[PDB]
Amino acid sequence: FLPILASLAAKFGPKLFCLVTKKC
């Protein structure tokens, strides 16, 4: 049901924190 959340987290997770910090 949920492996979309896992695939997004595992491939965009370290992007996401930098994206929040104005694309660091």
mmCIF file with all atom_site columns, C-alpha atoms in Angstrom:
data_model
loop_
_atom_site.group_PDB
_atom_site.id
_atom_site.type_symbol
_atom_site.label_atom_id
_atom_site.label_alt_id
_atom_site.label_comp_id
_atom_site.label_asym_id
_atom_site.label_entity_id
_atom_site.label_seq_id
_atom_site.pdbx_PDB_ins_code
_atom_site.Cartn_x
_atom_site.Cartn_y
_atom_site.Cartn_z
_atom_site.occupancy
_atom_site.B_iso_or_equiv
_atom_site.pdbx_formal_charge
_atom_site.auth_seq_id
_atom_site.auth_comp_id
_atom_site.auth_asym_id
_atom_site.auth_atom_id
_atom_site.pdbx_PDB_model_num
ATOM 1  C CA . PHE A 1 1  ? 0.000  0.000  0.000  1.00 0.00 ? 1  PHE A CA 1
ATOM 2  C CA . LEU A 1 2  ? 2.716  2.421  1.145  1.00 0.00 ? 2  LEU A CA 1
ATOM 3  C CA . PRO A 1 3  ? 6.097  1.541  -0.681 1.00 0.00 ? 3  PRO A CA 1
ATOM 4  C CA . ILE A 1 4  ? 5.797  4.830  -2.655 1.00 0.00 ? 4  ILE A CA 1
ATOM 5  C CA . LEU A 1 5  ? 6.557  6.636  0.649  1.00 0.00 ? 5  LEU A CA 1
ATOM 6  C CA . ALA A 1 6  ? 9.607  4.382  1.161  1.00 0.00 ? 6  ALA A CA 1
ATOM 7  C CA . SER A 1 7  ? 10.895 4.882  -2.435 1.00 0.00 ? 7  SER A CA 1
ATOM 8  C CA . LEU A 1 8  ? 10.432 8.679  -2.192 1.00 0.00 ? 8  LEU A CA 1
ATOM 9  C CA . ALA A 1 9  ? 12.082 8.779  1.282  1.00 0.00 ? 9  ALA A CA 1
ATOM 10 C CA . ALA A 1 10 ? 15.000 6.548  0.221  1.00 0.00 ? 10 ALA A CA 1
ATOM 11 C CA . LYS A 1 11 ? 15.751 8.548  -2.981 1.00 0.00 ? 11 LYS A CA 1
ATOM 12 C CA . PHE A 1 12 ? 14.525 12.122 -2.187 1.00 0.00 ? 12 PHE A CA 1
ATOM 13 C CA . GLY A 1 13 ? 15.015 12.226 1.659  1.00 0.00 ? 13 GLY A CA 1
ATOM 14 C CA . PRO A 1 14 ? 18.526 13.815 1.631  1.00 0.00 ? 14 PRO A CA 1
ATOM 15 C CA . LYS A 1 15 ? 17.304 16.131 -1.160 1.00 0.00 ? 15 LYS A CA 1
ATOM 16 C CA . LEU A 1 16 ? 14.280 17.248 0.936  1.00 0.00 ? 16 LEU A CA 1
ATOM 17 C CA . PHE A 1 17 ? 16.192 18.740 3.905  1.00 0.00 ? 17 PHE A CA 1
ATOM 18 C CA . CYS A 1 18 ? 18.377 20.746 1.497  1.00 0.00 ? 18 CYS A CA 1
ATOM 19 C CA . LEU A 1 19 ? 15.300 21.808 -0.558 1.00 0.00 ? 19 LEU A CA 1
ATOM 20 C CA . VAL A 1 20 ? 13.617 23.162 2.635  1.00 0.00 ? 20 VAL A CA 1
ATOM 21 C CA . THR A 1 21 ? 16.864 25.092 3.380  1.00 0.00 ? 21 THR A CA 1
ATOM 22 C CA . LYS A 1 22 ? 16.371 27.042 0.086  1.00 0.00 ? 22 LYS A CA 1
ATOM 23 C CA . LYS A 1 23 ? 18.144 24.394 -2.059 1.00 0.00 ? 23 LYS A CA 1
ATOM 24 C CA . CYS A 1 24 ? 21.445 24.057 -0.113 1.00 0.00 ? 24 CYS A CA 1
#
